[PDB]
Ligand binder design. Structure first.
Ligand code: HEM
Ligand code: HEM
Ligand code: OT4
Ligand code: OT4
Ligand code: H4B
Ligand code: H4B
Ligand code: ZN
Lengths: 414, 409
């Protein structure tokens, strides 16, 4: 436990100094003798004696951020939050604290490369929601607002916080907008192989699937612990980009398209010991997210093969690097399609450059910036981006976005 | 307690027990991960360290507690007493060197670890001897292009003022020169080291691919220059299977990668000079040596000849040019029958190696950050492979550059 930590950029020899790690909260899984850095995931709802210090920690942080630490209002808030916990075992966040918390959960998210945008986030309070129909209303407004006819804007919608654990609000979808995957009796998969499991859940709950290549899944929404309910998102609200290529005329004939709004809805927002199990947030895409992961991953659309077939690449020996050539072209198509349809999207070069600039600024005037190299480095051409050569410290700050069990694995059906 | 690692693309789960055996620290704490940080003895310390190594040696050849084991322990204890150190048997030395490669978390090429030719050079006393051992190493390892893995182990550190050191970072590297205007002729990574040779009276050909002389230090004395006989340096001209102009870039690289500035550590003994060599994974040359900004940096030039539009980043022009360069490199080596491996085959081998190690050994330390190839990452099997990283010994360690310590004489 020393007070300073340094990180070097081995390409630009710049050294930064981390003090912020001292405010780190929970353990990382790593120890003195092992490193879990590449491990993906290394109803105990809080009690009073647990919540007091967590609440106090966050409120102190909030008033520090707005330069009123030790003020009258600061002490009064503490007194109010502490009385509220003593007699309700919980407390509610003011709209300002809630908005602060959201933004800082994003800011604190070590695996996100797009954090340079963090302060610019539209927060939708939906803590007054009581039903699935209402959730759906809020989600539709979130999507229209975030999509903005292609000029995408980051936004989060926050539903009521957990209480006893039996009355949780959840979005069962992993993203608000995903394509269905249908397992076939002959062993193949139609649509998106990633979402096969969730598709069967939807179908079992009553969904009539069109059984197509690009079927937008419905929302599965749980309010206040009740069984979840199905809702079809209005097709006009889902912006989609058909994928084509600046040079390859045949690329359009592959028949691919993708949606514009990446909207993650299964994560959990934790602020001052409060747990918002349902907190969907959206931004715009990095190209490699659709181009490399969504399409080329073996257990995804796997058009790697077919593209290489249409490029007439030698696909008999790997050392021809037919896969790499193919992947690059696919990512060129994705970026070209989104840009043509003036839908917001960022390439992996521009984004990693942005994040380095963000990291430097965070170190300069916040004392550090937690980052996960393993996730920050893009899935293609890593070494020729600035982040590859950049040393990073990884630690967990609160407020944070966390993972949570899939709701179907925990839900007590009514 | 036991730990799992999932491959997410195949859902295969391995259980790690081996990590419980380590005692060297990683640089991480419970609260901070430093997995992307590149670099995070007397009688009294030396016996338990030796005892640890001797034990896992006699456990390795299934004679733990044998007459020999008991005696060998006694022999080593008596020697640390009366000399404040000890000497490794031949067998132990070869076992120890293979196992330092086996324990190399950042090495993707470890499937080959038991195939290692070990050259004992612990009788060496001068730079001239060192030179002789090194030339022999290069001749054997290069093997006319059918490369073979070797290590040459010079005497162990004693008091510290008598270290053996190969000052070159690799046995075969290219000189880099600081130009008058500001740019750099040749390999920029080595510009400091090139000036150290020029200082020693090396006459620089001042060209793009000049092979650097050896700088060798024995028993702590002043390092000395030696030219490597050119017939021993296997080189490859880089050209492209479709593009006719690629050879007009005048590029070429050496066949033998031989890292010579690390420190082998066995049973508490330190070998400050122990050059080891293997063969290349194509991205080491084509992605890092040629395309890094702090290196040969020829992407712009290539993509220019490929007539791509380079005005915006989102055309992925750096990306295209990069692939084409690595195709060339692989084509060039394979055409000259010089052992090389593509990052796809190398990663496949390593997943298989990992599974082997989890079977027969209970684990396999691995640094994901270094194992994942510096291009086309998520289309190699190792991207979706979870990996535990821990510090096993014997190991190869980093050491300071010798010109930062050595008081000249
Ligand atoms: C605005 C543009 C954004 C871009 C370009 C971006 C980019 C990315 C990328 C590429 C990843 C890696 C995930 C993957 O590989 O699938 C990621 C992760 C993540 N992002 Fe961002 N993101 C953006 C906005 C946001 C926003 C608005 C939030 C929340 C308010 C957010 C929170 C997160 C979290 C929590 C993760 C993963 C961390 C974890 O799994 O623990 N991101 N982002
Ligand atoms: C046989 C073919 C081999 C291949 C294809 C190979 C490949 C690689 C690659 C690509 C790296 C990453 C280094 C970088 O990119 O900067 C690496 C690291 C390394 N390799 Fe290998 N290698 C081979 C043989 C060997 C041998 C013979 C030894 C020693 C006996 C060895 C020991 C190491 C060590 C010590 C590292 C750095 C590990 C660390 O810092 O923990 N490798 N190797
Ligand atoms: C808001 C936002 C934008 C974006 N472009 N990518 C995200 C990616 C994620 C994300 C986080 C963890 C895991 C995943 C995908 C699972 N392999 C995505 C979350 C939010 C994102
Ligand atoms: C034996 C061998 C073969 C090979 N193809 N690459 C190596 C690469 C290394 C290595 C280790 C640390 C650092 C470096 C270069 C700086 N990234 C190389 C060591 C040995 C290697
Ligand atoms: C095994 C590994 O930790 C895991 O698959 C991670 C690696 N790095 C990643 N990086 C990004 N951006 N996205 C990912 O899904 C992953 N997967
Ligand atoms: C900062 C970062 O850890 C450093 O540049 C590492 C990252 N991973 C690497 N991986 C390999 N194989 N080779 C490298 O040189 C590096 N560089
Ligand atoms: Zn770690």
């Amino acid at each position: 436990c020393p007070r300073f930590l340094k990180v070097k950029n081995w390409e630009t020899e710049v050294v930064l100094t981390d003090t912020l790690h001292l405010k780190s909260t929970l353990e990382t899984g790593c120890t003195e003798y092992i490193c879990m850095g590449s491990i993906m995931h290394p109803e105990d709802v809080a009690t009073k004696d647990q919540l007091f210090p967590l609440a106090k920690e966050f409120i102190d942080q909030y008033y520090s951020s707005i330069k009123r630490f030790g003020s009258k209002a600061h002490m009064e808030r503490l007194e109010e939050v502490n009385k509220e916990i003593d007699t309700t075992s919980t407390y509610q966040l003011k709209d300002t604290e809630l908005i602060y918390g959201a933004k800082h959960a994003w800011r604190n998210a070590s695996r996100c490369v797009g954090r340079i945008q963090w302060s610019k986030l539209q927060v939708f309070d939906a803590r007054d929601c009581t039903t699935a129909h209402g959730m759906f209303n809020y989600i539709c407004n979130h999507v229209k607002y975030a999509t903005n006819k292609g000029n995408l804007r980051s936004a989060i919608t926050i539903f009521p916080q957990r209480t006893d654990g039996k009355h949780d609000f959840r979005v069962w979808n992993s993203q608000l907008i995903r394509y269905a995957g249908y397992k076939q009796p002959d062993g193949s998969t139609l649509g998106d192989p990633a979402n096969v499991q969730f598709t069967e859940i939807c179908i079992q709950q009553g969904w009539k699937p069109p059984r197509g290549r690009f079927d937008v899944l419905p929302l599965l929404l749980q309010a206040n612990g009740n069984d979840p309910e199905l809702f079809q998102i209005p097709p006009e609200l889902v912006l989609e980009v058909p994928i084509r290529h600046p040079k390859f005329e045949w690329f359009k004939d592959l028949g691919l398209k993708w949606y514009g709004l990446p909207a993650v809805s299964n994560m959990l927002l934790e602020i001052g010991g409060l747990e918002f199990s349902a907190c969907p947030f959206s931004g715009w895409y990095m190209g490699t997210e659709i181009g490399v992961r969504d399409y080329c991953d073996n257990s995804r659309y796997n058009i790697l093969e077919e593209v290489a077939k249409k490029m007439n690449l030698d696909m008999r020996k790997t050392s021809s690097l037919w896969k790499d050539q193919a992947l690059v072209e696919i990512n060129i198509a994705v970026l070209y399609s989104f840009q043509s349809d003036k839908v917001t999207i960022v390439d992996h070069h521009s984004a990693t450059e942005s994040f380095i600039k963000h990291m430097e600024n965070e170190y300069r005037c916040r004392g550090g910036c937690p980052a996960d190299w393993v996730w920050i480095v893009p899935p293609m051409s890593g070494s020729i981006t600035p982040v590859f050569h950049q040393e990073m410290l990884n630690y967990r700050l609160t407020p944070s976005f966390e993972y949570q069990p899939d709701p179907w694995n925990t839900h007590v059906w009514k």
